[PDB]
Design an enzyme around this catalytic site. Structure first.
Site, PDB file in Angstrom:
ATOM      1  N   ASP A  39      70.251  85.936  42.111  1.00 28.82           N
ATOM      2  CA  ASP A  39      69.512  87.050  42.728  1.00 28.82           C
ATOM      3  C   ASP A  39      68.007  86.774  42.796  1.00 28.82           C
ATOM      4  O   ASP A  39      67.279  86.954  41.813  1.00 28.82           O
ATOM      5  CB  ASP A  39      69.798  88.356  41.971  1.00 28.82           C
ATOM      6  N   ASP A  43      65.797  87.992  49.497  1.00 25.76           N
ATOM      7  CA  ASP A  43      66.632  88.614  48.466  1.00 25.76           C
ATOM      8  C   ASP A  43      68.067  88.099  48.569  1.00 25.76           C
ATOM      9  O   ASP A  43      68.867  88.634  49.343  1.00 25.76           O
ATOM     10  CB  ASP A  43      66.568  90.133  48.626  1.00 25.76           C
TER      11      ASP A  43
HETATM   12  C1  LIG Z   1      75.956  91.112  47.445  1.00 23.37           C
HETATM   13  C2  LIG Z   1      76.657  92.486  47.402  1.00 23.37           C
HETATM   14  N1  LIG Z   1      75.703  93.561  47.137  1.00 23.37           N
HETATM   15  C3  LIG Z   1      75.756  94.129  45.775  1.00 23.37           C
HETATM   16  C4  LIG Z   1      75.329  93.182  44.675  1.00 23.37           C
HETATM   17  C5  LIG Z   1      75.394  93.851  43.309  1.00 23.37           C
HETATM   18  C6  LIG Z   1      74.695  93.105  42.197  1.00 23.37           C
HETATM   19  C7  LIG Z   1      73.302  92.584  42.559  1.00 23.37           C
HETATM   20  C8  LIG Z   1      72.285  93.646  42.967  1.00 23.37           C
HETATM   21  C9  LIG Z   1      72.258  94.803  41.958  1.00 23.37           C
HETATM   22  C10 LIG Z   1      70.876  93.052  43.150  1.00 23.37           C
HETATM   23  C11 LIG Z   1      70.025  93.920  44.057  1.00 23.37           C
HETATM   24  C12 LIG Z   1      68.698  93.236  44.408  1.00 23.37           C
HETATM   25  O1  LIG Z   1      68.129  92.732  43.199  1.00 23.37           O
HETATM   26  C13 LIG Z   1      67.727  94.236  45.050  1.00 23.37           C
HETATM   27  N2  LIG Z   1      66.435  93.555  45.273  1.00 23.37           N
HETATM   28  C14 LIG Z   1      65.337  94.490  45.596  1.00 23.37           C
HETATM   29  C15 LIG Z   1      65.100  95.539  44.520  1.00 23.37           C
HETATM   30  C16 LIG Z   1      65.259  96.894  44.792  1.00 23.37           C
HETATM   31  C17 LIG Z   1      65.042  97.842  43.803  1.00 23.37           C
HETATM   32  C18 LIG Z   1      64.665  97.445  42.530  1.00 23.37           C
HETATM   33  C19 LIG Z   1      64.506  96.101  42.230  1.00 23.37           C
HETATM   34  C20 LIG Z   1      64.091  95.665  40.830  1.00 23.37           C
HETATM   35  C21 LIG Z   1      65.277  95.593  39.893  1.00 23.37           C
HETATM   36  C22 LIG Z   1      63.360  94.346  40.831  1.00 23.37           C
HETATM   37  C23 LIG Z   1      64.728  95.163  43.231  1.00 23.37           C
HETATM   38  N3  LIG Z   1      70.807  94.269  45.234  1.00 23.37           N
HETATM   39  C24 LIG Z   1      70.922  95.527  45.677  1.00 23.37           C
HETATM   40  O2  LIG Z   1      70.319  96.461  45.153  1.00 23.37           O
HETATM   41  C25 LIG Z   1      71.859  95.745  46.819  1.00 23.37           C
HETATM   42  C26 LIG Z   1      71.796  96.848  47.667  1.00 23.37           C
HETATM   43  C27 LIG Z   1      72.730  96.998  48.687  1.00 23.37           C
HETATM   44  C28 LIG Z   1      73.741  96.066  48.852  1.00 23.37           C
HETATM   45  C29 LIG Z   1      73.854  94.989  47.975  1.00 23.37           C
HETATM   46  C30 LIG Z   1      72.891  94.818  46.981  1.00 23.37           C
HETATM   47  C31 LIG Z   1      74.906  93.937  48.180  1.00 23.37           C
HETATM   48  O3  LIG Z   1      74.980  93.392  49.263  1.00 23.37           O
END
Ligand SMILES: CCN1CCCCC[C@@H](C)C[C@@H]([C@H](O)CNCc2cccc(C(C)C)c2)NC(=O)c2cccc(c2)C1=O
Length: 377
Positions: free
Chosen positions: A35, A220
């Site tokens: 990530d 990302d």
């Molecule tokens: C690949 C499939 N998936 C879900 C992946 C689940 C597991 C990893 C998933 C928590 C990391 C963050 C990633 O880190 C976000 N990056 C920016 C960010 C936004 C808010 C806060 C922060 C801080 C923590 C630094 C960082 N991704 C998401 O949220 C996300 C949202 C929608 C769809 C998907 C993922 C997806 O496609």
């Protein structure tokens, strides 16, 4: 020695790319989602219906409790747990072991994915966005501080269930063709970049370029879709709808919910446009572009009914926290996270898409004035 890291990533479409890692002594093997959108290293450390295995601190003679809690809320999903340190290695990575911070996940909400085959997350971004605060050193910073691994890594995310390579410590020249084009990392928190122009089928969206980076643009790997700020999302969808109006799609399709299908091998790729993202370059008034094929933003999904057709989901979503260049944008490109030189490189990947008359590309140089005005403050 980068050949040992080629093909070290696996995953299921839309469920994230993961690398194998070991934690603790004796080593405990876990699959860890890669990530670039966050900065905490965290692993499941308590039973969960979607976890096939998890980190057992009690079985590790090298585990050290930090006696501090932690929680991370993402755009989708959240977890909480206990901070501690332990010895970590990457079997198909550099031949080193490091002591790194690890968040032992004890509770989670819509974080783990059923059948994804990964049990943790490797946040590769910078300390500024680490939780609980920037004093919790991220994994890659620890690797670089404790070993001789150079301060950079590269990601080759390949489409169709999915595979790829994370080259830790360098660039593997057999994984790309053509030239690498570099954009500055605007600020070291997320991997923040500046988009200076957007074209759809060669037609300029003609928006204030600040709209493209409102309130930021990031690279990302932990997000599947290309995510666009509200105003940019609406313009792109309007343009994509018009280019493909000869076919009917339920409006739920344009929201990333309902899938669209066509008879096997008859997907009308020609009616979906190419998207060109222009990125700030390395020299004054210079940019370059990456071109996204519809095979990137129309993600193939499993057929809900009889597995005879070719079905897809619209992999572009609206954002309220800026542009997100997610996995489908990175797929087909070789992306170099050159932390040492504060830049991100793009080149055509060796595992590129194979459209009939069109080809994904990274092209430059272009002249673009006042690029600094495209950054939002
Ligand atoms: C690949 C499939 N998936 C879900 C992946 C689940 C597991 C990893 C998933 C928590 C990391 C963050 C990633 O880190 C976000 N990056 C920016 C960010 C936004 C808010 C806060 C922060 C801080 C923590 C630094 C960082 N991704 C998401 O949220 C996300 C949202 C929608 C769809 C998907 C993922 C997806 O496609």
């Amino acid at each position: 020695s980068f050949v040992e890291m080629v093909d070290n990533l696996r995953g299921k479409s839309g469920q994230g790319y993961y690398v194998e890692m070991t934690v603790g002594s004796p080593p405990q093997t876990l699959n860890i989602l890669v990530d670039t959108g966050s900065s905490n290293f965290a692993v499941g450390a308590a039973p969960h219906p979607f976890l096939h295995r998890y980190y057992q601190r009690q079985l590790s003679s090298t585990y050290r409790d930090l006696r501090k809690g932690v929680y991370v809320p993402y755009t989708q999903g959240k977890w909480e747990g206990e901070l501690g340190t332990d010895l970590v290695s990457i079997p198909h990575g550099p031949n080193v072991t490091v002591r790194a911070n690890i968040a032992a996940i004890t509770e989670s909400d819509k974080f783990f994915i059923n059948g994804s085959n990964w049990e943790g997350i490797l946040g590769l971004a910078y300390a500024e966005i680490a939780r609980p605060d920037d004093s919790l050193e991220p994994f890659f910073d620890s690797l670089v501080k404790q070993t001789h691994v150079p301060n950079l890594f590269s990601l080759q995310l390949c489409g169709a269930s999915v595979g790829g390579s994370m080259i830790i410590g360098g660039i593997d020249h057999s994984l790309y063709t053509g030239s690498l084009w570099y954009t500055p990392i605007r600020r070291e928190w997320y991997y923040e970049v500046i988009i200076v122009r957007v074209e759809i089928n060669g037609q300029d969206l003609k928006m204030d370029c600040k709209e493209y980076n409102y309130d930021k643009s990031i690279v990302d790997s932990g997000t599947t879709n290309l995510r666009l700020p509200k105003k940019v999302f609406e313009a792109a969808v309007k343009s994509i709808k018009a280019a493909s109006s000869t076919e009917k799609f339920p409006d739920g399709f344009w929201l990333g919910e309902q899938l669209v299908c066509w008879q096997a091998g008859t997907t009308p790729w020609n009616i979906f446009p190419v998207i060109s993202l222009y990125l700030m370059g390395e020299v004054t008034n210079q940019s370059f572009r990456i071109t996204i094929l519809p095979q990137q933003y129309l993600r193939p999904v499993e057929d809900v009914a009889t597995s005879q057709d070719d079905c897809y989901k619209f992999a572009i979503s609206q954002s309220s926290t800026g542009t997100v260049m997610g996995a489908v944008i990175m797929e087909g490109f070789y992306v170099v996270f050159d932390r040492a030189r504060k830049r991100i490189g793009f080149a055509v990947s060796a595992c590129h898409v194979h459209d009939e008359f069109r080809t994904a590309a990274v092209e430059g140089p272009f002249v673009t004035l006042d690029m600094e005005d495209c950054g939002y403050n």
